Structure formats: C-alpha cells, structure tokens
C-alpha cells in the first residue's frame, strides 16, 4: 500500500487499430507528413505517431533531425527492436521521472515539433505532468535539508498542505575550510530548502508526498562533507573504457547528491562501475549479490581494481 505513482497510460480509446477511417490526430500528422515532402526532403515524418501502444522512429533519413533524435527523442522511449537505416520501434513507460531536466510540456512541444504538429491523442497528455520534478537532498545536518526545487511554484500547494500535516521547522589552517563553505551556494537557483522534522517522520511524510501529484528524488550528499567515517579507497591503475565513463557522468552531472540506476548489456563492466562507485564516492558501501555465485566474483574484481583488502572484505 502507498506505492502508486503514475502507471503507463494507454488502455482504451481505440477500436480495430486499423484506423483507416478515423486516425484523427494522425490525420493532423498525415496532413503535414505528406504536405511537407515535395522538394527532395521530407520536412515531415512525425515518427508515425500512434495513439495506443507506442510510436515509432523514422531513422531512415534522419540526417540531423532524427539522427540527433536517434538518441535524444529516446528518453521516454526505449527502442525495443533495432534495425538497419530504416524505422525503429520502441515502447513507452515510466521514463519521464527519469527525464527531469525538462518539462513534460517542453517535450510535448518538441513532441509536436518533431511531429510537424502531429497532434497527440491526449493519452500522453493526461499522463505528462503527473509527477512534477522534486528532489530530496540529504544535506550536512545528518539527515536532510528539506530541498524543494530550482522552481518555486510547488511549495504553494505543499506548504499549504504539508506543515498542516507535518511541519518542518589556526587561521590559514581554517581559512580554506570556510572557502569550501563559501562554495555552498544557491543550489543553481533559490533552493527553497526547509529543516528536518526529526528524522522519523519522513517515512510518515514520503507516503503523503506522492499523495497529491508530486514525486520525490532521494539523493546522497556523501562526498563534500560527511560526518561519519570514510573507508580507505584506492583505485590501483584501473584503466577503464568510455562506455562506463559516460555512466557515472550521468550519475554525476550535478553536484555530489544524486542516486543512480544504470542498465548495461550483458558481460559489460558490471563489477567495475560499482567498484568505481565504491571508491570515488568515498562511502562505506554494500553489495547485494544474487547468490554466492555473484559474491565470489564481485569481490574478485574488487580485489583487482581496488587494493582494499586487508581483511577489509565482507562477504
């Protein structure tokens, strides 16, 4: 219970999907995917927006338009089959709460701007901003500072609901120490961060945070300052490769507080980046192996690309 964010939308509004008759919002597309291709370029081609199921990728004359968006349009898509220089199908899911450096209306504009006003059914519309971007920093005072957002227009519903549920509130040797605290700036703009309600109330709060129409992003401020201890990490000449160099760069494009979940293909640097996350982050980490089968393996490359082993090993 209390585990309900926005499930994947399309369930209805369609009957015998051969919409040779209706295709009404696709007729908005099929107007401009067809009115536009006359003089040797298409300037059209809406990714073949289909209301139910998913939509496609053009990817056959991408040039710059959809070849840039061979990747970038795929944020909420997943591109489930792969092909030759032709169309490419996908699916659709939860992947807007990952795409939180952008507004659901901002993509909707470019969802239209890709589609040459190939208009949504609305199915996506009633599923665009169901979860407004919102983070949960874990700042220096031992639990969390009640961060909201770069943008203000969300506390206006929140503080009119949340506190009426649950409130919130030598020289040169030390000169640089406040120069670090000087770097503790506005968190890109305004932050709007509040004070911990006694560390035992967030569980009571999180279940009601999502309860209106928001969703929360748990972070990990464990790198600049940390009050408990730090283990000895040491990356002994572990030269690695740009598939996983991009990975932690996606885990850290911001500051030192954001969690992460990354998919690799099989046989990839699985026991590398977590071992890289074991050492760079400066935490005291944990692996949850699938079986002891995993457990022997994952320490072994940890025994390889970390010299952290002086009975410092916990299987």
């Amino acid at each position: 219970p209390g585990n309900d964010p926005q499930e994947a939308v399309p369930s209805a509004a369609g009957k015998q999907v051969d919409e040779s008759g209706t295709k009404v919002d696709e007729y908005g597309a099929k107007d401009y995917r067809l009115q536009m291709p006359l003089k040797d370029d298409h300037t059209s081609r809406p990714l073949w927006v289909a209301p139910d199921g998913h939509i496609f990728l053009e990817a056959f004359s991408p040039v710059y338009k959809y070849a840039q968006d061979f990747l970038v349009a795929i944020a909420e898509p997943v591109c489930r089959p792969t092909h030759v220089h032709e169309y490419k199908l996908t699916a659709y899911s939860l992947y807007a709460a990952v795409s939180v450096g952008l507004q659901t209306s901002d993509i909707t504009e470019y969802l239209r701007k890709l589609s040459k006003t190939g208009v949504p059914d609305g199915i996506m519309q009633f599923i665009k901003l169901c979860t407004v971007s919102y983070g949960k920093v874990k700042l220096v005072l031992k639990h969390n500072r009640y961060f909201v957002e770069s943008c203000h227009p969300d506390v206006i519903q929140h503080l009119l609901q949340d506190p009426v549920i649950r409130e919130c509130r030598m020289d040169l040797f030390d000169f640089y120490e406040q120069m670090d605290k000087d770097e503790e700036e506005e968190e890109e703009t305004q932050t709007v961060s509040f004070e911990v309600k006694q560390e035992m109330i967030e569980e009571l709060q999180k279940r009601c945070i999502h309860l209106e129409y928001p969703l929360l992003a748990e972070y990990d401020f464990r790198n600049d300052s940390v009050n408990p201890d730090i283990n000895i990490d040491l990356k002994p000449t572990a030269v690695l490769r740009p598939y996983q160099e991009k990975s932690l760069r996606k885990m850290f494009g911001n500051g030192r507080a954001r969690s992460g979940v990354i998919v690799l293909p099989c046989g990839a640097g699985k026991s590398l980046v977590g071992v890289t996350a074991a050492c760079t982050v400066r935490k005291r980490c944990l692996v949850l192996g699938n079986s002891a089968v995993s457990v022997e393996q994952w320490k072994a490359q940890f025994k390889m690309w970390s010299t952290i082993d002086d009975s410092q090993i916990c299987r």
């Binding site: 640089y176 670090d180 932690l248 760069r249 850290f252 760079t280």
Partner: peptide, 11 residues
C-alpha cells in the same frame, strides 16, 4: 572530473 570526482584543491 565527475568520474574520478575532482578534489584538486588541497582540502
């Protein structure tokens, strides 16, 4: 650097 996590001032 984000990967190797820049700490280049002597903190």
């Amino acid at each position: 650097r984000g990967n190797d996590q820049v700490a280049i001032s002597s903190k």
